[PDB]
Ligand binder design. Structure first.
Ligand code: ZN
Ligand code: ZN
Ligand code: ZN
Ligand code: ZN
Ligand code: ZN
Ligand code: ZN
Ligand code: ZN
Lengths: 222, 219
């Protein structure tokens, strides 16, 4: 099982630099090219560069010469990409991928991708979120079923992890994308259960904000 | 660089029907060795992209042959003979014949289905928030189709436009429906000066706006 594991989200200040890592496993690291791809605001991919860890040979997209520097540590099977002097356009999700093209064969092998690393270029300060429980009053949906909610607001930067009952309750939940407003994000999640479950059994909202090292569990009380 | 134009931008197809996506390039993708390096990728919601086809028509291992690729020169087409729920996502063409490699803008494939009216839930401010001097009234409009919906908040009969924060989820790969959240944030003081808070929606499934409200008061 071939696997590419990337580093976590990063909050960078304008003008500074970051080194992203792409740890590989399950294949001979030195025999395949690793490419880096960039994705901004959804559908919009750009090819950055590729490195052949076996030799250290690299090829860059003219647009990125001077912006990205690719390296690879054979002893640890980790490819790195350093971005220098970050600006607005640099906020994006970066992916690493063992593309799989074999030049000599003029054919391809399966492509493996990393999960992606989100880079945020901002000078705004890190803020812990407030987690508020949403118990129904009119948001009851009447009997039969009842939906509860969880409001996570005023945090920076992304991401925040929200689960219900420590991951146990995964069906019927809707976690909405966080929306930025005035340097702070807001995110909400709703969970629809049967009238028999709640308030008979407890429903708890779990939230984690790594950047602040904030972890909070809110119990949806009536 | 080579410009790759994909059309359509989005396509709504019912499960079982065929779907085809076009990709045009500013230069022939025929390489000097006679091979044409055109690839098609699929990025599933919340997932990294994955290559479906390479060398114009060669399927990658583990890719269902419901998917077909074809074309030459500057015009290429990806065809899904019979679409399933797993085909939901954005498709891209990537050319590797010319340097640097360039991608198409993407084509979002959405599963067309039977209309579904929203299930609305409205929630008053939690005790905790009010303590901080803030008040948010949340409204959830779950599982509807089509995605097109218009929600407006009304306090004591008047439309409130300032302080509204909306968020929509992508098409659910389980029921093909959409859900959206609308939060209206006020100060504690003003919240306690009004009575009725109404979450009003406009959707295809109703000739009249879908309403959900509550009257805040005391006791
Ligand atoms: Zn092949
Ligand atoms: Zn060329
Ligand atoms: Zn040439
Ligand atoms: Zn008034
Ligand atoms: Zn009045
Ligand atoms: Zn009023
Ligand atoms: Zn009044």
């Amino acid at each position: 099982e071939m696997q590419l594991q990337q580093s976590g989200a990063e909050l960078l200040r304008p003008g500074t630099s970051v080194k992203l890592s792409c740890k590989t496993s399950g294949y001979i690291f030195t025999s395949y090219w690793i490419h880096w791809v960039k994705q901004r605001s959804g559908q919009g991919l750009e090819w950055i560069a590729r490195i052949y860890p076996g030799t250290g040979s690299t090829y860059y997209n003219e647009k990125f010469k001077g912006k990205a520097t690719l390296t690879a540590d054979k002893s640890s099977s980790t490819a790195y990409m350093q971005l220098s002097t970050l600006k607005s356009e640099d906020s994006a999700v970066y992916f690493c991928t063992r593309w799989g093209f074999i030049p000599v064969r003029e054919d391809y092998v399966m492509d493996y991708w990393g999960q992606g690393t989100l880079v945020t270029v901002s000078s705004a300060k890190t803020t812990a979120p407030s987690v508020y429980p949403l118990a129904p009053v009119c948001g009851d949906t009447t009997g039969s079923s009842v939906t509860l909610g969880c409001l996570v607001k005023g945090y920076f930067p992304e991401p925040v992890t929200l689960t219900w009952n420590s991951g146990s309750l995964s069906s019927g939940v809707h976690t909405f994308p966080a929306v930025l407003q005035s340097d702070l994000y807001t995110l909400s999640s709703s969970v629809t259960v049967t009238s028999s479950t709640w308030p008979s059994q407890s429903i708890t909202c779990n939230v984690a904000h790594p950047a602040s090292s904030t972890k909070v569990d809110k119990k949806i009380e009536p | 660089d080579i410009v790759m134009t994909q059309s359509p931008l989005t396509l709504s197809v019912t499960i079982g029907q065929p779907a085809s996506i076009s990709c045009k390039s500013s230069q022939s993708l025929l390489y000097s060795n006679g091979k044409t390096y055109l690839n098609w990728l699929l990025q599933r919601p919340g997932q990294s992209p994955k290559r479906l086809i390479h060398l114009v028509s060669k399927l990658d291992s583990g890719v269902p042959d419901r998917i077909t690729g074809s074309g030459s020169g500057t015009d290429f087409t990806l065809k899904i003979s019979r679409v399933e729920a797993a085909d939901l996502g954005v498709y891209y063409c990537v050319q590797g014949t010319h340097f640097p490699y360039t991608f198409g803008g993407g084509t979002k494939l959405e599963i067309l289905r039977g209309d579904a009216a929203p299930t609305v839930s409205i929630f008053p401010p939690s005790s905790e928030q009010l303590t901080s001097g803030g008040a948010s009234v949340v409204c959830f409009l779950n599982n509807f189709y089509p995605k097109d919906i218009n929600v407006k908040w009304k306090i004591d009969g008047s439309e409130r436009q300032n302080g509204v924060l909306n968020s929509w989820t992508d098409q659910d790969s389980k029921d093909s429906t959409y859900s959206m959240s609308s939060t209206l944030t006020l100060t504690k003081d003003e919240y306690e000066r009004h009575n009725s808070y109404t979450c009003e929606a406009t959707h295809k499934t109703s000739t009249s706006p879908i309403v959900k409200s509550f009257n805040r008061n005391e006791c």
